[PDB]
């Protein structure tokens with residue numbers, strides 16, 4: 060196993076515009092196969108990256124900035140990871156989805172709006188080359204990645220992930236740490252071969268003779284953890300307050316972070332932006348696609364080496380010497396100036412201030428069947444991706460979604476376009492529900508903790524519970540999607556279309 064904490068943390072450069080004016084900002088990003096060293100003792104690794112970078116460059120915009128990004132495919136015609144042709148036409152398809160973006164439907168990166176190299180071939184839902192991001196939403200941590208039909212888990216694992224930040228000039232008065240002291244942290248677990256090449260399972264453990272090859276796997280757990288493209292890195296920090304945009308860009312793995320010196324995290328934001336009130340945390344869970352906007356005060360730890368630790372297991376308990384480690388902070392950098400940043404308690408207006416009428420209430424269940432090969436096929440409400448759309452909210456209206464989870468594992472449920480509030484969680488008799496379809500609660504409703512009292516777009520739906528959320532579908536109408544963000548699940552039909560009707 061690679062030696063931990065020997066490479067410094069890379070800080071992705073901020074992408075510079077091809078053209079910019081007061082009325083518009085135009086960017087160009089090209090997907091390319093490239094090589095990068097992920098660790099001091101590894102040979103270079105072959106990856107796929109936006110502008111040839113892993114992670115891709117960080118994009119910074121202001122609220123309401125009129126942005127355009129021309130995402131281009133200039134990758135090889137053949138993939139380098141195991142493709143299962145039985146779960147679903149050029150071999151390499153790509154489409155960029157701005158996760159968390161309030162985007163017009165033809166710029167949202169629909170799974171079937173893919174395109175091959177140079178846009179030679181395009182999916183049935185392709186409409187445009189240059190994506191449009193009006194950015195008329197709250198300041199927040201967004202991130203972009205590939206979303207191609209049936210290839211999402213592979214393209215993302217290949218390295219197609221990047222951070223996107225929306226800055227709301229009105230929040231500047233909070234004086235939160237900024238600039239050099241505002242650092243994004245993209246966490247991705249990977250398994251790397253001796254030759255430095257990426258390893259992605261070609262099939263499940265002990266493959267059945269009647270199983271396809273390659274064969275998609277229901278989940279993926281890497282043996283190594285990276286942050287911003289480097290294995291267990293270290294970051295030199297000044298003894299003061301820092302802001303971190305934590306992003307889980309992993310296929311399956313869920314993290315449960317904490318600091319080994321017992322220090323606290325100060326959560327100031329969730330997927331949807333600033334929380335109404337800051338929350339002191341000793342630890343926090345972060346499933347795939349979830350984002351935590353936090354402040355860490357290093358002021359009193361000058362000289363110390365602090366480890367960002369993980370206690371959540373993935374396909375087993377955490378290994379103290381490996382996946383139990385994320386990165387290491389080193390409070391040894393001299394202060395460049397006085398720490399003028401603040402860690403205010405009053406961050407933003409409450410979401411509950413809004414009083415919307417409940418137009419509809421959808422009850423959805425997390426299930427699945429089994430294919431001809433004996434493999435599990437996860438389905439949202441027992442429907443397949445290709446079946447006729449069923450989740451059809453009306454633009455401008457608010458609905459309550461009740462997600463029933465009779466499975467034995469947690470599912471990070473994500474809805475495109477919108478941001479939503481969490482109402483509560485409640486346990487139920489799984490056996491009963493599975494045998495009679497009847498839902499019987501075995502305890503009271505549990506309201507969300509301070510962490511989920513803001514706006515979320517990716518939410519954890521625990522096993523044996525019913526999760527209720529509320530969302531106002533808009534401002535745009537069109538064809539979008541909602542799905543589990545565990546890529547291995549998403550690619551084998553745990554994804555459904557979502558039509559916001561007008």
Ligand SMILES: CCn1/c(=N/N=c2/sc3cc(S(=O)(=O)O)ccc3n2CC)sc2cc(S(=O)(=O)O)ccc21
Pocket residue numbers: 277278280311312313372373374375426427435437466467468469
């Ligand atoms: C319902 C799930 N579906 C499977 N894949 N899903 C997975 S893989 C997975 C890994 C983690 S981890 O870090 O994030 O360990 C957490 C949650 C996970 N889930 C969702 C629970 S495997 C299966 C077997 C049966 S049984 O009836 O074959 O005989 C029935 C249904 C099945």
Ligand SMILES: [Cu+]
Pocket residue numbers: 156158204348544
């Ligand atoms: Cu996403």
Ligand SMILES: [Cu+]
Pocket residue numbers: 437469470471543544545548549553
């Ligand atoms: Cu899932």
Ligand SMILES: [Cu+]
Pocket residue numbers: 156206473475540542
């Ligand atoms: Cu998505």
